[PDB]
Amino acid sequence: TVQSERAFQKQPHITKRWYKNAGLGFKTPKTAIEGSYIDKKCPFTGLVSIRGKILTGTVVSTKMHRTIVIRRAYLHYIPKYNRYEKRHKNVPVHVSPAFRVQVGDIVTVGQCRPISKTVRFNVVKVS
Amino acid sequence: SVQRDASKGYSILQQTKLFDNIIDLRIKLQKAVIAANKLPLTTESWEEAKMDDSEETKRLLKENEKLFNNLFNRLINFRIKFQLGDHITQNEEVAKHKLSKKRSLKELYQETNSLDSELKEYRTAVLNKWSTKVSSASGNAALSSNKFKAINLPADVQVENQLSDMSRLMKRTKLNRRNITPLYFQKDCANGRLIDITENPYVFDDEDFYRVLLNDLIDKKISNAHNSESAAITITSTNARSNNKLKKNIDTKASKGRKLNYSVQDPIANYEAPITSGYKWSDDQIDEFFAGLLGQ
Amino acid sequence: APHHWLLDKLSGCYAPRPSAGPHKLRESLPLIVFLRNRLKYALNGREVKAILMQRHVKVDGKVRTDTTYPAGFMDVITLDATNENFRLVYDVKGRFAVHRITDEEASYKLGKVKKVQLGKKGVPYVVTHDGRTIRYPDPNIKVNDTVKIDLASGKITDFIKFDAGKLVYVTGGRNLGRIGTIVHKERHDGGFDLVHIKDSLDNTFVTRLNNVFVIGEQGKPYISLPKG
Amino acid sequence: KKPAEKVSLLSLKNGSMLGYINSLLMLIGNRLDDECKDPSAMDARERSIQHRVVLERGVKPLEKKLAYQLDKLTRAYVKMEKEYKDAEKRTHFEDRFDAREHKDRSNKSRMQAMEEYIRESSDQPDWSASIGADIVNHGRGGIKSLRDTEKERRVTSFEEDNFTRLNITNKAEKRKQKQRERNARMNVIGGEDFGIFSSKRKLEDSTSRRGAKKTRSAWDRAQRRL
Amino acid sequence: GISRDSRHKRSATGAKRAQFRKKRKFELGRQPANTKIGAKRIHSVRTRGGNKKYRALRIETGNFSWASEGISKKTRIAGVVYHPSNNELVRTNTLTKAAIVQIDATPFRQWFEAHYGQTLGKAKIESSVESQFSAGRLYACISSRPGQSGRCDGYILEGEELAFYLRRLT
RNA sequence: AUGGUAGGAUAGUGGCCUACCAUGGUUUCAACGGGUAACGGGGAAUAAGGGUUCGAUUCCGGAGAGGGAGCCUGAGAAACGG
C-alpha cells in the first residue's frame, strides 16, 4: 500500500487533496486527483511546480521505482558531413504514480525544481 | 513500381522477424555457455569430478550428450534449409542428401566447415556487390577518390583487413571480466597441466562481442518493437550480464564505510607506535586470572 | 560599447556604464549619452551634471538628478526649451531614436505588464517593465498585456488585451523593432512562444513571447511613431 | 507463384549469425568432451572471431547506410495493409542579437576604380580642392590623396558638429601618422596614387556580372533585360 | 569545514574528481547544530549579510497543535521516544523535525475542563488517547526545523497517526 | 554509484551530507581512455578606403601572499586592508 516507511507523509498545500492547475495547457487524470498515494514530489497535488521548459520523448527504461529513463533523440544535422545522424541522450525523469508507464509510450516532460542531481524533468501527459 | 518496391518491404521485415528469432536462440544458449566455462578442463580433472556423484553425473552427462547431439543435428539441418531457401548453396542435391542422413559428431563437424565455406564464397560476392552499390548511389566516388583511400575501402576489404590480425582479436576473447574459475582450475595449474585472471586462455568468455551482440540486440529490438512487441528487448539480456558478475559484487555498507575495511589506511601507520612490555605483571599469573576469574 | 547607443568610435575610451535602475542593463541608457552624445546637446559631463542640478530637465514627471539614470523603451523626457517634450522609439536598423511629442500624448505612456499577483491584505497588483507597480488592476488583463500610466498618478487610463491581429511591437531577440508588428501567435517545443510579425513590405518572421509590446491598432496606434 | 525477392545482405546477415550459434555449439561440445585434446578450442575461436567482423564491420555499416531505403520499402508495406484493411472494412534556435547585421555593406569592398569610372561617366562635379591648399608641409608630405581628403572632411565634420578637438597622442600617432606618411611618400605621387596597381588584391568578388544573386534558372536574366 | 558544494560529487558517468576550486565563503556547509532538552539557549548566526538564523541549542517547551478543534498552548517537554530517520538520535534526546516526543499536556486538560466541564473517565475524541491522559504523557511530533528557527513547534498525533506509530514503536 | 522517503545543513533545489530501503544508471548514435607553448582558441572588436585572410583591440587556464590548520567582520570576501 501507500504506507511503506517509518513516517506518515502529507503535503501542507501552502477538499483533503488540493487540485493544482499546471498551466501551459494541462489537466490532471482522474486517477491522480482521486488517488491515495501521497507523493509530495509528484508535480500534481504537491509542493513542486511545473513551469518553463517542455520536451517530448520516448521512455526507454522503467526498471525501478518512481523514476524512469526517457530516450529523446534527433537525426542531428552535421554540417560538414551534410548528414542527419540519429543521436540519443537518455535523460532520467521522475514518474508520478498516476500513469502506468511502460517502454515506448510517447510522453511529455518538463522541469520540476530538479530533484536529485540528474532528474531534471517530470512527466505530465501520456499518449 | 509501387507493388515491386514494397513487396521487398515484406521481404525485409520477414527477414528482420527471422533475424530476431535466431537471437532468441542466442539468448537461451548462454546458460549453457556460462556453465561450460566452469567445467573441468583437463582429462584428469573430469575423472575426479566423476568420483563424488558418480551415478548422478553419468545419467546427466548422457542426458547432456543426447540433448547436445539432438540440438547439433537440427541446427545443421536448419542451416542447410536456410542456405537452400536463400540460394546460398548452389548444390541442392548434396544438401538434400545431408538432411536425411543420421550424422555423428565428426560428420556434423565436417558439415560445419562445408556450410561455412559456402557462406564465405557467398559473403565476398555480396559484400563486394553492396559496397559498390552504396558508393555509386551516394555520389562520393567523384569527390573522395584522391584523399581518403585508407578510409573508403570496400566493405569486403574492410572485413579482411581486420582479418590480417587474428592475434590481437584473440587476445580480446580471453578477457575474463566475469571472474569465472573452472572446476579444479587451481589444481591443474599447480600440477602443470595448464596469477592474472584477467587473461585466461582455457576460460572461454566470449562476452566481449556478446555484450556488443547484446548491444546489437537492444539496437535491433528497439527498432523491431515498433508495432506491438518483439522477442526480448532487455529481459534476460542485461540480467545475463548481471548475474555472471554477481549483480555488481558490491556492498552498500562497504561503500559508506558502514562495513569494516580490512585495508591499510596509509597515513595512520606509526604515530602511536607501540611500546615495550607494558604489562606490569608477568602475564602468566594473569592467565591464571583469566582461567580462574576473580568474578567467576 | 554596443551599436544601439549609436555613438561614434571617436571621443571616448571608457563608455559610461549605466547605474542601477528600473531597466535591464542591455537596453539601458544614461542621460549623459542622451544629451551630449546623441542629442549633441551638451559637450562635457560636467555641464551634464550642471544640467541635472539646475533642474531644467526631467524624466517621467520626476526631476531625477543622476548622470547614469538608465533609459528604457519610449520614456517621457521633459525639457524646458520652448516647452518641448521628448519620447524615445526603436528603429529597424539597430539603433535608438528620440523625437518630439506634444503634451497630450506626453501625458500618457503605454507600457507592457510584467507580472500580476495578489498582494498584502488581499489586494491585487500588477508590475510593468519599468518597475512601476499598479494596484487594483484590470482583472481581465493577463501576462504580456499592456497598460497606460497617468504620469500624474500610477493608475490606468487605457489597456488592450494581447491578441492576434493588432499592432504588437517587437523588442529584444535576434530582431529589434520591425514596423508592422503583427501576424499571430502559436506554441513551440521548449517553450519560446512563437509570435509572427508582418511588415508593410509583407514578410513574416517569428519571435518570442517576452518581446511582446502591444502598441496599438491598424490605422491609429497610441504611440506617435514618426515618419522615416 | 514467383517467390518474393529476398535481400541478399539480410540473408548474409542472417546467415553469418546462423554461423555463430552453430560455431558456439562446438564450444559447448569441446567443454563437454572428456577426451578433448584442445581445451582452448582454437578452431571455433577463429570461426567466432571470423564472422563478427562481417557482423560488426561488414553488414552493420552497410545496413546503417541503407537504413533509410530499407525503412522506405517497409513503410509502403505498412501503407497498403492499412489501405486494404480500410478497403475490406468498406527544434532549437537562438533568437540572439548580434553585431554584424547592421554595419554598412561598403567598407569591405569600396572599390576606387568603379567610383572613378562613374565619376567620369555620370557627369557629376566632384568638389575638387584649390591649387595651393592641398599640400601639407611644403615638400616631403604629398600633394593630396583622395583618401586623405575623405578622412579630413569626416574628422572636421566631427569638429563642426560635436564641437570638440582631439589630441596627437603617441599611441595612435606611431601608426596613424608615420606609416600613413611613409605610404604617402611612395603611393600618392603628384596628387595621384600609383601603388594600388602594384597591389595584389583580386577584383572579382565585389563585381562578377555586376552583383550577386545571378544564375540559377533562365528567368533571373530574362526579367533583367526585360 | 563541511562542504555543501556540488562539484565534489562524481558525475552521472562518474567523472574522476576534476578538482576545480577549493572551498570559498559561499558554499559554507555549516555544522550540524544538534540540540537537547534543558534550559533555553539561543545563538544568532549572521549569514548573507542580513539574514539572522536562530540556532536552538537547548529548548524546554513548544507550541504544539491539536487538529481536531484547532488549538495550541504552551507545553513542557518530557522526552523523545521515536524518530523515523534515526534511532540513536532518540537515545541522545535531540529534537529535530518530525521527532515523536512526550509532553505532560496539563493545560490541554485544563483547557478541556474549561471548554467542556467533564472529567476524562477517571464533541468527543477517540479512545486511544484516553489511555494516557491518566498517564499524563502525551505524544507529539515536531513540525518546524529547530536548527534555523530557534523555535519548537509540532502537533499532537491524530487518529491513524497513533495507529501507525505505536506499530512502529513496537 | 542511481533513485525513494525522512532528517541535518544551506539564502535555496538538491545524495550536498546522514539514516534506512530498492538495486541500479551511461554507452557501437563511442560511455571510459592516450595529443595539444589550449603566448592557442574567443565576430572579443573595429577595421585594414587593397600591407593576399586582420597590421592592430581585448577576453583569456589557475593558485597564492613563508608553509600546512582553524577563526573573524562586510549588500561586498573563506581578505594578502584581521
Distance E114 CA to F74 C1' (A): 54
In C, what residues contact A, Cβ < 8 A? 187, 189-191
DSSP state of B147: S
Backbone angles phi, psi at A71, to 5 degrees: -85, 110
Residue with grid cell 520477414, as numbered in its chain: B14
Pairing of strands E153-155, E61-66: parallel
- Looking at chain A, which residue has its C-alpha nearest residue E84? A6
Inter-chain Cβ pairs, chain A and chain E, closer than 8 A: 15
Give the whole-angstrom CA distance, residue D66 versus residue D61: 9
Instruction: Kindly list the residues from chain D whose CB atom is less than 8 angstroms away from the CB atom of residue B68.
Output: 25, 28-29, 32
The CATH number for A101's domain is 2.40.50.1000
Give the whole-angstrom CA distance, residue B171 versus residue B167: 7
Q: Touch between chain C and chain B (3+ CB pairs, < 8 Å)?
A: no
Residue D7, judged by CB atoms within 10 A of its CB (0-12, 13-18, 19+), counts as buried
DSSP state of B1: -
**Which one, of E52, E69, E57, lies nearest residue E32 by Cα?**
E57
**Contact, C137 vs C154, CB < 8 A?**
no
Give the whole-angstrom CA distance, residue B32 versus residue C202: 73
Distance C14 CA to F80 C1' (A): 30
Chain breaks in chain D (C to N over 2.5 A) after: 90
Residues whose CB falls within 8 Å of the CB of residue A60, separated by 6 or more in sequence, listed in order: A69, A70, A71, A88, A90, A103, B222
| Nearest residue for F48, CA–C1' | D108
Give the whole-angstrom CA distance, residue D79 versus residue D71: 12
Instruction: Kindly list the residues from chain A whose CB atom is less than 8 angstroms away from the CB atom of residue C187.
Output: 25
3-state secondary structure of B11: helix
Pairing of strands E41-47, E51-59: antiparallel
DSSP state of D58: I
Per-residue CA distances from C57 to C46, C98, D138 (Å): 15, 15, 51
Distance A47 CA to F3 C1' (A): 20
Residues 203-222 of B with CB under 8 A from A: 222
Give the whole-angstrom CA distance, residue D197 versus residue D186: 13
**Contact, B218 vs B226, CB < 8 A?**
no
Nearest-5° angle of CA E129, CA E132, CA E134? Answer: 125
Nearest-5° angle of CA E48, CA E52, CA E58? Answer: 135
Q: Is A103 in Cβ contact with B233 (below 8 Å)? A: yes
Give me the amino acid identity at E134. Answer: S
Characterise A85 by phi-psi region: left (phi > 0), alpha (psi -120 to 50), beta (else): beta
In what order do the strands lie in the sheet containing C182-186?
Answer: C182-186, C194-198, C204-207
Residue C117's DSSP bridge partners are C125
Domain that holds residue A9: 1-127
Cβ contact D64 with chain F strand, < 7 A: yes
Distance E3 CA to F39 C1' (A): 37
Specify the nucleotide whose C1' lies closest to residue A86 (CA).
F29
Residue B272's DSSP bridge partners are none
Per-residue CA distances from B261 to B254, B258, D85, E10, E57 (Å): 7, 9, 68, 22, 35
Cβ contact E150 with chain F strand, < 7 A: no
Residues E60 and E92 in one domain: yes
Number of domains chain A contains: 1
Give the whole-angstrom CA distance, residue D19 versus residue B206: 15
Inter-chain Cβ pairs, chain B and chain D, closer than 8 A: 190
Which positions in strand F are less than 7 Å from the protein's CB atoms?
Answer: 1-20, 22-33, 43, 45-53, 55, 62-64, 69-71, 73-78
Q: Count of alpha carbons within 13 Å of A104, Cβ hemisphere only? A: 15
DSSP state of B270: S
Q: Touch between chain E and chain B (3+ CB pairs, < 8 Å)?
A: no
Give the whole-angstrom CA distance, residue D172 versus residue D150: 19
E169: contact with A, CB 8 A cutoff: no
Q: At what angle do helices B54-85 and B105-138 cross, to 10 degrees?
A: 40
Residue with grid cell 581628403, as numbered in its chain: D149
Which of E12, E85, E161 has the CB atom closest to A8's CB atom?
Answer: E161
Residues E23 and E55 in one domain: no
Residues E142 and E72 in one domain: yes
Per-residue CA distances from B189 to B179, B185, C191, D210 (Å): 16, 6, 66, 86
Cell numbers that stand for B253 in this block? 555498507
Distance of CA C85 to the CA centre of its chain: 15
Residues E19 and E38 in one domain: no
Per-residue CA distances from E134 to B47, E92, E100, E108 (Å): 79, 27, 19, 13
**Contact, C110 vs C78, CB < 8 A?**
no
Tell me how many helices (H) and strands (E) chain A has.
1, 7
**Which one, of B69, B89, B70, lies nearest residue B80 by Cα?**
B89
Residues E16 and E68 in one domain: no
Experiment used for this model: cryo-EM
Give the whole-angstrom CA distance, residue A61 versus residue E38: 52
Which of D5, D13, D19 has the CB atom closest to B8's CB atom?
Answer: D5
Residues E12 and E42 in one domain: no
Residues 56-85 of A with CB under 8 A from B: 60-61
**Contact, D26 vs D46, CB < 8 A?**
no
Distance A115 CA to F13 C1' (A): 7
Distance E163 CA to F5 C1' (A): 20
Distance of CA B122 to the CA centre of its chain: 26
Q: Count other Cβ atoms within 10 Å, centred on residue E108.
A: 18
Residue with grid cell 561614434, as numbered in its chain: C8
Q: Cα-Cα-Cα-Cα dihedral of D27, D29, D30, D36, to 10°? A: -160
Cβ contact E16 with chain F strand, < 7 A: yes
Backbone angles phi, psi at C76, to 5 degrees: -90, 120
Which of B7, B16, B206 has the CB atom closest to D48's CB atom?
Answer: B206
Give the whole-angstrom CA distance, residue B270 versus residue C50: 77
C187: contact with D, CB 8 A cutoff: no
Residues E8 and E66 in one domain: no
Report H helices in chain B.
2-28, 30-37, 43-52, 54-85, 92-99, 105-138, 155-162, 166-172, 185-190, 207-224, 238-244, 252-256, 285-291
Distance of CA A118 to the CA centre of its chain: 13
Give the whole-angstrom CA distance, residue C61 versus residue C141: 26
Which of the other chains make 3 or more beta carbon contacts under 8 angstroms with chain D?
A: B, C
Distance E31 CA to F8 C1' (A): 9
Cβ contact E124 with chain F strand, < 7 A: no
Residues E168 and E144 in one domain: yes
Residues 230-249 of B with CB under 8 A from A: 233-234
For chain C, give the secondary structure using H, E and C.
Answer: CCHHHCCCCCCCCCCCCCCCCCCCCCCCCCHHHHHHHHCCCCCCHHHHHHHHHCCCEEECCECCCCCCCCCCCCCEEEECCCCCEEEEEECCCCCEEEEEECHHHHCCEEEEEEEEEECHHHCEEEEECCCCEEECCCCCCCCCCEEEECCCCCCEEEEECCCCCCEEECCCCCCCCCCCCEEEEECCCCCCCEEEEECCCCCEEEECHHHCEEEECCCCECCCCCCC
DSSP state of A66: T
Residue with grid cell 526631476, as numbered in its chain: C63
- Looking at chain D, which residue has its C-alpha nearest residue C37? D162
Residues E20 and E74 in one domain: no
**Which one, of D29, E19, D12, lies nearest residue B125 by Cα?**
D12
Q: Structure resolution in Å?
A: 4.0
Pairing of strands E51-59, E36-37: parallel
Per-residue CA distances from B37 to B197, B203, C23, D22 (Å): 14, 6, 73, 18
| D interface test, pick of B2, B3, B12, B200 with most D CB neighbours within 10 Å | B12
- Looking at chain A, which residue has its C-alpha nearest residue E157? A8
Cβ contact D147 with chain F strand, < 7 A: yes
Residues E16 and E100 in one domain: no
Q: Count other Cβ atoms within 10 Å, centred on residue C16.
A: 18
Residues whose CB falls within 8 Å of the CB of residue A66, separated by 6 or more in sequence, listed in order: A39, A94, A95, A97
- Looking at chain B, which residue has its C-alpha nearest residue D50? B163
Give the whole-angstrom CA distance, residue D102 versus residue D123: 32
Cell numbers that stand for C64 in this block? 531625477
Specify the nucleotide whose C1' lies closest to residue D150 (CA).
F49
Domain that holds residue E49: 31-105+137-170
Residues E25 and E96 in one domain: no
Residues E50 and E26 in one domain: no
